[PDB]
Design a protein around this ligand. Structure first.
Ligand code: GDT
Lengths: 250, 233, 244, 196, 222, 204, 244, 243
């Protein structure tokens, strides 16, 4: 027994590339499309729920997850790798921040934490990099709203809008055209649904599309009352119904 | 073929063999001959000590593990040290804790299991030595043959090492005769020396070349060398 | 066993070279260019942002210039992710020094520790080296303005002007052609911008593809100051140096 | 605390008072010292509340796992796990546990685990502070293979006396009947057992 | 400290006083002894203030992460098991005495945990130095099937029994209502029966009264 | 024997109109023997102030610790830490040592740069937080400070009045404590400026 | 590609584990051994090749006991077999210690199973070169089992492994059909001595010694014991007779 | 370089061959299984092939009782099947002990799935050649079917099938639901749902079964149990008296 793989499985090639990080990115490319757009009063992230059998219930699965009440994530690549990263992300937001300052971390920093996890999966012994890329969106009092993309290499950068996965190239171009620095959240949601429509082959409805927004505080989603400063989570996943209603004004 | 399956002991060949273990066994055949045989009252060991130059000495082949047990070796001398030393501790543990003499049959089981561990985990290497253990316990005299594979067997007599087959056959033939040499060590020792000279070739057994060990009923495992083995050559 | 898949990232080539380090440098060679120019009254750091987009948020971005201390900063060339792991341990080392001695950590001391860490992965552990090279630009009261550079091997040296990343040979020559000891900060700032402008693999040198930082001792104060330029700031200075 | 377990013709019955005190103050007057570790294996808890609850919760975990792998555990086994925990940690535990279970082959069984951590199998067993006052009574009234009624009465009397004398006992008397028929919870109030 | 728990027809309610102390000195005239483990699972705590707060947060943090992982509302028995197992692990050294309550997919619940780790269950409970004063009121007015309003009254009175009669308790009354179907409502300073009477005189000193030796400005801007 | 009473000293913080004040004595002694009359107990990290009374060695240690932490905090958060956050940091920093604490009594004071709101708070040796809206006291003469404040104090004082009040509370409290005194310093904090004055008091 | 048979935990493209399969080779090549589940216990028998007249008769015993109610016999790499028994012995002791009751044959089976299955998970270990037939009497009956180097095991009426593995399997199936009502322990012993003699024809080259042990509720009190002296000679004859 | 096919690291295409080859081993038993949801019960059907005559049929099974309410059926070799089962049972017991309530079928799945994902990323751990189907009647979710594979993937189903002829069984059910328009078998008693399950199994595989060719498991409110030869024999007759 005993993991005898105490050496790096990701090393440098004579050309200067890091194979596994490259191959890992290849896997991200193959994955389903997902995108993000930053408006002036919110951010939106979406992807396609590519059911893997009509017998499978795509509701029993989230591609768009909540990290903290003000930060959501979405991916492209290998589902299981995203899943464990979401758990790790939620935990680290607590162990390394909320438990020390009594407040949830700000987007960039939580994003910085996730990146570190992936970076280590790039150099630690006996492991392969993570085969996914994340689009993390959130909001914090001193930074406003933000959208970051984290690659298997462990790198990350901020975006006004962007997409990853299958039709990312097409999608990116389409976004560069429609995006401006005066968009209201709804506008971006609309644009999002539009951009997504191209990458979608089959059905396109509230049951095949998964979208969430980081908008205003939902006091109604708090669960309790009586504490002025606690205003509610800004992150809200939309409902199947909420999606369709907009698909009509598409 | 064999080249792709002998890099270590944690690999089986397509025919279910463990080469590393088999190469170990080879070290024994390359080793100097030694013989073991017993009766109902005594157990004997006879070994042919080998030497380097004529300016060197004849490396010891027999080790005493306790007052009632001992063994002779063929192969990597360092490993025999490690193993006989382990057997000494086990003999010692039995005395201290249970005030009981370790049975030969049990010593054998202990050896087997120790050897085995080194043939199933990465990093280890089989032992490269063969041992013939004699001893007198509660159920009489005993003779065991230990192979690096882990197989320990109880026999009336046997031989291991280069040209061992000569002696083994002689014993296999003389069986009914020596197995009855009770109450007379000098005779069992002669049948011992004879059996071993059946594997000679290069030279003839001399005084500082032959080595005898004897254990039994009222005989604490004792070793004989040089002048001591004179009366048998 | 596992010996089968072991790359042995820590051995010598028959020529007495360390493969991984070599290859990691090869990696760095394709990284955005970064230059450090040290004038008489300050130090300048400039780097080229590798890969950009209309959509890339530049005001929130930082992929090459990191603040380590109040008087020390670094320009990076290589794997950003790797860089951060090291950048953070440096920021800590800086603080420990303070906590223990009650004095700011001397620029070289911080540089040596960081370089020792790299050297480690070079000699034991079966792990890959960090694909990163640093240009440290700091100031202390024991040596004043200093400019250092460290790479995957764990070696570091001092410079008057130096660049790392892509097109270093070209950048070094251009620097080696116009650098003068009696230089002034703004002089260095210009030499800096111009050097990049000539090594750039891009069409033109726009502000949105640059990061700038200076360590000067504003006379009307008496204390050294770090200033990492904002997009609108790089844009201004860009027009002024005559690159519009 | 006053607790006991009695075996009879149809299986076994467990009884307990419901008083848990912290000094002279009755912290809880409606306590349930009758804990379930398996379908038909229960226990009576005396000693430290925290210690017995923690031990119980652990035994329950072990038996749940025992089942998943090897099926239904015997009452003797549940006693063993208790005994193991109690003996091995004797220096940091103050728990007196009575283990009772219903088997189809063995019918009713009772095991008592005193402070030392030793195990004792008996026809019936009493324990707890109030148990000392009814040693003579129980010894003179217990009989083997009594009927469910004779047994529910033996326990109701015995415990009413224990509660009478021992100030560390009181409240309501709780019972648990374990037989092939199933599991039955019983409760008796002061107004009833006080006038017996 | 005086903390209580009272179950009513469609939920549970917990209340507490607001006085904190060190010896005979009032440390905090209005501290909050009501802790939120999750949106609908609140815990009232007595003993060593810093401990009830800390232990409350720790389990609160883990229940949140657990909730997220399982995609299920938190259960009060979950908080109860994580809490008690933690306290038991510390042999009682963590001086926390808690009354934990709330509603979840399985109904309304009321428990109490003692620093050594043992737990209790019931329709009404109290802990703290005001423990007995309160329980006296609860044993005198609790009845089965209380309404949300009766429960708050009972709870509120039991706490008052402590403020007045217990030297370790005082100031105000904090309440938290957790009804099976609605959002839990935290009522901080539900009652404020101890407002200080206006002082007899103003002590505003005439400027220049204090003798200064030296003066200077401080630098905050980096 | 009692760690919190080997060195001595006191700290007090008050809130006024759009301003907060924090003051401390300057004594550092070893039992009855006075050793230094320049041991200040107030420090600051950005616009946040921290007073620390108790065993001097721990007073020094915690200062060096919070410097360290607030520094890295600014480097990562890219902004200065706020009073409310710093309070939380102090609390968890202390409870981190729950079973072998620093024998100190921290006091936090500052105005929230973003909200302009005044903020003061006290902690016990294991991190318990007390966030008052009027005043926080700490030190060997805390009982005295309590009597002084509970009386003298009144809401919304002006920076010029709050100075008189906090100075009077400090002074008269210190004079009834053998382990406090030997000088004092008072900080008056406003959203824009901070004034540090040294007081004239008995030296016995 | 290829080489999917060099490391112990690797799946070949068709989903197999060659190292495990090779382990089986070691087994099939070993002495034949069997198990017969009678009406209130089980009987174990094994072939002991007399490699020479030098081997002391009745000595080198193969069958092993686990605790007091479990019997084990295996084919293949003997040392590997003892190693497995040694683990069963601790495995059993551990069980009895905590649950008081001697370990149920079924539970013991899975204990051995999980252990063996574990040696097919890592390339730092080798699979067991033995197939084991073991069983005994417990709280509810007698059980017979056989564990494969892969970790697989199932309950049997009869079982065999080794060189004469096919002769035996044939004979055992005959017993099953000619005894739908069960075989007694007394009968299973003789019927076992025969099966060995017959299965010994695939090794008829070397002479052999027989070894039988049984665990019967009515014959041994649910305890494991070797069949010695008379009852043994009797079964020896019963076979010697029907071999001709 | 060509060892990206021996351990779990990426191949140039971004694939993990070892994971794929593991999937291949799942069909090794040549047994199909399927699960459907009742109105308030969940049923799992699986083929049972005991070829040898020396085997004790009662000991052969790929259906496991993880807890009082959770049952698991395994498609793959038995040694990996039992390893997986044991781990699940432990995870079950521990979860109860720590959180004070029975682990929900979906959660146990997610936990086993994440466990697999690890063997996917760590080089010294090989995946397990098995697909796991968990079923129960969750106190919050109701009849549930969650399945996990060597890839670390998992999801819930209206119904599902696994094995060599998985695709035939799937399309069969697919059609039944396209028809019925509802996500379950609108039946009150479980016996009728067991019968439906066995029926469509026959229709899709095009085969007749005896009482020893099947293995049935049922999950009801607060209990999961498996049927005996006879319980099936009786269920088989029932469908017979309908054809
Ligand atoms: C409830 C009041 C109550 O229930 N009982 C009255 C007594 C209660 O304990 C007072 C408590 N006061 C505090 O919590 C105060 N802080 C402390 O007591 C701190 C103690 C620290 C001890 C550290 C030494 C550790 C040695 C470890 C060796 C391994 C104030 C300042 O908060 C209180 O008011 N409780 C209320 C909630």
């Amino acid at each position: 027994m005993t993991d005898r793989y105490s050496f790096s499985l990701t090393t440098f090639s004579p050309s200067g590339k890091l194979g596994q990080i490259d191959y890992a990115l290849t896997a991200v490319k193959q994955g389903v499309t997902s995108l993000g757009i930053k408006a002036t009063n919110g951010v939106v992230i979406a992807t396609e729920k590519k059911s893997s059998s009509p017998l499978a219930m795509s509701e029993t699965l989230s591609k768009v997850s909540l990290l903290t009440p003000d930060i959501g994530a979405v991916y492209s690549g290998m589902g299981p790798d995203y899943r464990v990263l979401v758990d790790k992300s939620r935990k680290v937001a607590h162990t390394s921040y909320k438990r020390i300052y009594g407040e949830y971390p700000p987007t960039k920093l939580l994003v910085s934490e996730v990146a570190k996890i992936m970076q280590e999966a790039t150099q630690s012994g006996g492991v392969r990099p993570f085969g996914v890329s994340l689009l993390i969106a959130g909001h914090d009092e001193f930074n406003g709203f933000s959208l970051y993309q984290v690659d298997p290499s462990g790198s990350y950068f901020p975006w006004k809008a962007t997409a990853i996965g299958k039709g990312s190239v097409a999608a990116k171009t389409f976004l560069e055209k429609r995006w401006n620095d005066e968009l209201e959240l709804e506008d971006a949601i609309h644009i999002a649904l539009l951009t997504l429509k191209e990458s979608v082959e089959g059905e396109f409805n509230g049951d095949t599309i998964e979208l969430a927004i980081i908008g205003d505080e939902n006091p109604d989603l708090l669960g309790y009352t009586g504490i002025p400063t606690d205003k509610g989570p800004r992150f809200r996943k939309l409902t199947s119904q909420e999606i369709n209603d907009r698909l009509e004004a598409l | 073929f064999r080249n792709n399956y002998d890099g270590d002991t944690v690999t089986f060949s397509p025919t279910g063999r463990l080469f590393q273990v088999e190469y170990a066994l080879e070290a024994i055949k390359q080793g100097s001959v030694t013989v073991g045989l017993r009766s109902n009252t005594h157990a004997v060991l006879v070994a042919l000590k080998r030497n380097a130059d004529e300016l060197s000495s004849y490396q010891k082949k027999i080790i005493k593990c306790d007052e009632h047990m001992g063994l002779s070796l063929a192969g990597l001398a360092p490993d025999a040290r490690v193993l006989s030393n382990y057997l000494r501790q086990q003999c010692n543990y039995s005395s201290l804790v249970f005030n009981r003499k370790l049975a030969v049959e049990r010593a054998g089981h202990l050896l087997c299991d120790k050897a085995q561990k080194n043939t199933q985990s990465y990093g280890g290497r089989p032992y490269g030595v063969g041992l013939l253990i004699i001893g007198y316990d509660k159920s009489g005299a005993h003779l065991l043959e230990f192979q690096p594979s882990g197989n320990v067997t109880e026999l009336y007599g046997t031989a291991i090492g280069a040209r061992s087959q000569g002696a083994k056959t002689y014993l296999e033939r003389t069986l009914d005769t020596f197995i009855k040499i009770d109450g007379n060590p000098d005779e069992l020792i002669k049948a011992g020396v004879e059996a071993i000279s059946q594997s000679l070739r290069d030279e003839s057994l001399t005084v500082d070349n032959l080595s005898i060990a004897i254990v039994g009923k009222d005989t604490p495992f004792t070793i004989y060398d040089g002048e001591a083995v004179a009366k048998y050559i | 066993g596992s010996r089968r898949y072991d790359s042995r990232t820590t051995i010598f080539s028959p020529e007495g070279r360390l493969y991984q380090v070599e290859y990691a440098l090869e990696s760095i060679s394709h990284a955005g260019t970064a230059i450090g120019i040290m004038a008489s009254d300050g130090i300048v750091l400039a780097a080229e942002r590798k890969v950009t987009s209309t959509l890339l948020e530049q005001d929130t971005s930082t992929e090459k210039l990191y603040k380590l201390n109040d008087k020390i900063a670094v320009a990076v060339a290589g794997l950003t992710a790797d860089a951060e792991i090291l950048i953070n341990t440096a920021r800590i080392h800086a603080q420990n020094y303070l906590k223990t001695y009650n004095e700011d950590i001397p620029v070289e001391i911080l540089v040596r520790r960081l370089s020792d860490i790299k050297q480690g992965y070079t000699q034991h552990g079966g792990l890959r080296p960090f694909g990163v090279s640093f240009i440290y630009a700091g100031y202390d009261d024991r040596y004043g303005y200093q400019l250092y550079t460290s790479n995957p091997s764990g070696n570091y040296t001092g410079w008057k002007a130096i660049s790392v990343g892509a097109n270093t040979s070209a950048a070094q020559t251009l620097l080696q052609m116009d650098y003068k000891d009696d230089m002034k900060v703004d002089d260095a700032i210009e030499l800096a911008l111009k050097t990049l402008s000539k090594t750039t693999d891009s069409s033109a040198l726009t502000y949105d593809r640059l990061e700038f930082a200076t360590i000067r001792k504003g006379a009307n104060d008496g204390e050294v100051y770090q200033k990492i330029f904002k997009p609108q700031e790089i844009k201004d200075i860009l027009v002024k140096t005559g690159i519009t | 605390t006053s607790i006991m377990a009695v075996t009879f013709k149809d299986g076994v019955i467990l009884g307990a008072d419901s008083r848990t005190t912290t000094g002279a103050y009755i912290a809880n007057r409606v306590t349930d010292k009758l804990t379930r570790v398996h379908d038909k294996i229960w226990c009576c808890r005396s000693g430290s509340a925290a210690d017995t609850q923690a031990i119980a919760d652990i035994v329950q975990y072990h038996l749940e796992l025992y089942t998943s792998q090897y099926g239904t555990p015997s009452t003797e086994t549940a006693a063993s796990v208790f005994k193991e925990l109690c003996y091995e940690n004797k220096d940091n535990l103050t728990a007196g546990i009575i283990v009772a279970g219903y088997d189809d082959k063995n019918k009713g069984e009772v095991y008592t685990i005193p402070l030392g951590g030793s195990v004792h199998k008996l026809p019936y067993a009493i324990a707890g502070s109030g148990s000392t006052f009814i040693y003579g009574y129980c010894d003179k009234n217990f009989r083997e293979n009594m009927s469910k009624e004779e047994t529910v009465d033996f326990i109701k009397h015995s415990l009413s006396q224990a509660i009478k004398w021992d100030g560390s006992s009181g409240g309501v008397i709780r019972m648990v009947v374990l037989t092939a028929a199933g599991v039955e919870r019983l409760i008796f109030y002061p107004d009833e057992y006080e006038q017996l | 400290t005086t903390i209580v728990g009272v179950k009513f027809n469609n939920g549970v309610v917990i209340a507490a006083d607001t006085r904190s102390t060190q010896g005979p000195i009032v440390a905090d005239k209005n501290c909050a002894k009501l802790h939120r483990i999750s949106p609908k699972i609140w815990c009232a705590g007595a003993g060593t203030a810093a401990d009830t707060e800390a232990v409350t947060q720790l389990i609160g943090s883990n229940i949140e992460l657990h909730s997220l992982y399982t995609s299920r509302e938190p259960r009060v028995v979950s908080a109860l098991q994580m809490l008690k197992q933690h306290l038991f692990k510390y042999q009682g050294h963590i001086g926390a005495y808690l009354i934990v309550a709330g509603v979840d997919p399985t109904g309304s619940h009321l428990f109490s945990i003692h620093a050594h780790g043992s737990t209790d269950v019931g329709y009404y409970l109290s802990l703290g130095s005001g423990s007995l004063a309160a329980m006296a009121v609860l044993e005198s007015h609790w009845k089965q099937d209380l309404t949300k309003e009766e429960a708050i009254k009972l709870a509120s009175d039991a706490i008052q029994a402590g403020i007045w009669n217990d030297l370790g308790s005082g100031s105000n009354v904090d309440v938290c209502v957790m009804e099976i179907g609605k959002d839990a409502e935290y009522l901080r300073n539900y009652l404020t029966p101890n407002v200080r009477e206006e002082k007899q005189k103003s002590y505003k000193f005439p400027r220049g009264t204090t003798a200064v030796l030296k003066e200077s400005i401080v630098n905050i801007c980096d | 024997s009692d760690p919190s009473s080997i060195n001595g000293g006191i700290v007090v913080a008050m809130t006024g109109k759009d301003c907060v004040a924090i003051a401390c004595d300057l004594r550092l002694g070893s039992q009855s023997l006075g050793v230094s009359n320049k041991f200040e107990k107030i420090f600051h990290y950005g616009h946040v102030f921290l007073g620390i009374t108790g065993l001097a060695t721990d007073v020094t240690t915690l200062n060096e610790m919070f410097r360290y932490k607030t520094n890295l905090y600014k480097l990562k958060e890219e902004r200065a830490i706020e009073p409310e956050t710093f309070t939380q940091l102090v609390s968890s920093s202390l409870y981190e040592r729950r079973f072998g604490p620093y024998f100190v009594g921290p006091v936090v004071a500052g105005i929230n740069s973003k909200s302009g709101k005044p903020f003061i708070a006290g902690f016990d040796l294991i991190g318990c937080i007390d966030e008052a809206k009027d005043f926080i006291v700490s030190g060997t003469a805390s009982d005295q400070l309590f009597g002084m404040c509970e009386s003298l104090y009144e809401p919304n004082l002006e920076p010029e009045d709050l100075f008189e009040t906090i100075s009077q509370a400090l002074l008269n409290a210190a004079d009834r404590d053998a382990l406090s005194g030997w000088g004092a310093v008072v900080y008056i904090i406003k959203k824009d400026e901070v004034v540090k004055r040294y007081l004239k008091m008995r030296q016995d | 590609g290829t080489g999917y048979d060099l490391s112990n935990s690797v799946f070949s493209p068709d989903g197999r584990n060659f190292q495990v399969e090779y382990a089986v080779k070691a087994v099939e090549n070993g002495t034949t051994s069997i198990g017969i589940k009678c009406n209130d216990g089980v009987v174990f028998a094994v072939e002991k090749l007399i490699t020479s007249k030098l081997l002391v008769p009745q000595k080198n015993v193969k069958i092993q006991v686990v605790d007091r109610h479990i019997g084990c016999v295996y084919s293949g790499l003997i040392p590997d077999g003892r190693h497995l028994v040694n683990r069963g012995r601790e495995e059993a002791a551990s069980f009895k210690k905590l649950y008081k009751t001697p370990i149920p044959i079924p539970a013991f089976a899975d204990r051995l199973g999980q252990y063996v299955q574990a040696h097919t998970l890592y390339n730092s270990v080798r699979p067991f070169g033995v197939s084991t037939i073991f069983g005994g009497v417990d709280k509810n009956g007698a059980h017979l089992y056989m564990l494969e180097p892969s970790g697989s095991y199932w309950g049997y009426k009869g079982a065999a492994t080794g060189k004469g593995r096919q002769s035996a399997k044939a004979e055992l199936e005959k017993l099953v059909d000619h005894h739908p009502e069960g075989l007694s322990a007394r009968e299973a012993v003789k019927q076992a001595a025969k099966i060995i003699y017959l299965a010994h024809e695939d090794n008829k080259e070397k002479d052999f010694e027989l070894e039988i042990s049984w665990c019967s509720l009515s014959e041994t009190n649910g305890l494991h014991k070797f069949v010695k002296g008379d009852l043994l000679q009797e079964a020896i004859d019963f076979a010697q007779k029907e071999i001709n | 370089a060509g060892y990206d096919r021996h351990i779990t690291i990426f191949s140039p295409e971004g694939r993990l061959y070892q994971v794929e080859y593991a999937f291949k081993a799942t069909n090794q038993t040549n047994i199909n299984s399927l699960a459907v949801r009742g109105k308030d019960c969940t049923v799992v059907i699986s083929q049972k092939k005991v070829p040898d005559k020396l085997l004790d049929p009662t000991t052969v099974s790929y259906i496991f009782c993880i807890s009082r309410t959770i049952g698991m059926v395994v498609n793959g070799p038995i040694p990996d099947a039992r390893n997986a089962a044991l781990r699940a049972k432990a995870e079950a017991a521990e979860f109860r002990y720590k959180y004070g309530y029975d682990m929900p079928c979906d959660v146990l799945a997610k936990r086993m799935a994440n466990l697999s994902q690890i063997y996917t990323q760590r080089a010294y751990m090989r995946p397990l050649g098995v697909i796991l189907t968990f079923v129960s009647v969750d106190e919050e979710l109701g009849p549930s079917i969650y399945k996990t594979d060597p890839a670390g993937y998992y999801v819930g189903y209206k119904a599902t099938a696994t094995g060599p002829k998985q695709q035939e069984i799937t399309t069969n059910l697919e059609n039944h639901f396209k028809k019925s328009k509802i996500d379950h078998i609108n039946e009150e008693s479980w016996e009728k749902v067991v019968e439906f399950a066995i029926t469509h199994m026959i229709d899709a595989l095009g085969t007749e079964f005896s009482k020893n060719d099947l293995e049935v498991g049922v999950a009801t409110k607060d209990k999961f149990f498996t049927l005996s030869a006879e319980n099936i024999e009786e269920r088989l007759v029932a469908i017979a008296e309908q054809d």
